[PDB]
Ligand binder design. Structure first.
Ligand SMILES: *S(=O)(=O)C(C)(C)C(=O)NCc1cn(Cc2ccc(Cl)cc2)nn1
Ligand code: NA
Length: 240
């Protein structure tokens, strides 16, 4: 997250860190959202490389023991069957990870609330991106979870020629684009939390940013629109 602020420890308890094994240790690669005690929602592109993954829930500072983390293996990966790693712009950038064990819920570990199927946010709706991704274009990961206020940019604006054009689809949510605040590498897979009827719900899964930089005017961060996939999510959970 570029242009973010450090999140309070208990603010976003559904946020997870998706990590892969690197030598004798682990490296953060993506965010995700805990949606059941044994299921995480992330981006399909986060699992394009065949690596050993783990999920960390209750995480705040990646480099330090917070006394709140639970570490769990990934037992099954279900990518959307229409996902094409060579065509991110086509959409379908969503995957479900079945965890090897059910995590325990507490003030630091809670299920993310998903939107009602079909919900589309009005332009300029209030949302926050969270993650440990880069804090500057070409920079380094955040040590502590960051948040940034990223109001939505509706489809008509986002898919217009001076924004993303045809690359953005109606199955995506755009947010931000103010040139200062944005998602960045390593936020992918994580949530966009949007305030609807007084409750925050996870309306986006971070999918891509501009090749030209993370915080670029009129290149808002682009997210998979969770409300386009409610039936798919429920079908996966019920059949696995
Ligand atoms: S996201 O918008 O943050 C973005 C820019 C697409 C991103 O940085 N995604 C992170 C990501 C994760 N993976 C899979 C991967 C590749 C290589 C290695 Cl060593 C581990 C994991 N690809 N992009
Ligand atoms: Na920690």
């Amino acid at each position: 997250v570029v242009g973010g602020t450090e999140a309070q420890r208990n603010s976003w308890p559904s946020q997870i860190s998706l990590q892969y094994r690197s030598g004798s240790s682990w490296a953060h690669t993506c965010g995700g959202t805990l949606i059941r005690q044994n299921w995480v929602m992330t981006a399909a592109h986060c699992v394009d490389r065949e690596l050993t993954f783990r999920v960390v829930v209750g995480e705040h500072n990646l480099n330090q023991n917070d006394g709140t983390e639970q570490y769990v293996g990934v037992q099954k990966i279900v990518v959307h069957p229409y996902w094409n790693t060579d065509d991110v712009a086509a959409g379908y950038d969503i995957a479900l990870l079945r965890l090897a064990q059910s995590v325990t819920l507490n003030s630091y570990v809670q299920l993310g609330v998903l939107p009602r199927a079909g919900t589309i946010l009005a332009n300029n709706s209030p949302c926050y991106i969270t993650g440990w991704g880069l804090t500057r274009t070409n920079g380094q990961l955040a040590q502590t979870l960051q948040q940034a206020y990223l109001p939505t940019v509706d489809y008509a604006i986002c898919s217009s020629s001076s924004y993303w054009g045809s690359t953005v689809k109606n199955s995506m949510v755009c947010a931000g684009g103010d040139g200062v605040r944005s998602g960045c590498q390593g936020d992918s897979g994580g949530p966009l939390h949007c305030l609807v009827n007084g409750q925050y719900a996870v309306h986006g899964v971070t999918s891509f940013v501009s090749r030209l930089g993370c915080n670029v005017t009129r290149k808002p961060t682009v997210f998979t629109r969770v409300s386009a996939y409610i039936s798919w999510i429920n079908n996966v959970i019920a059949s696995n």
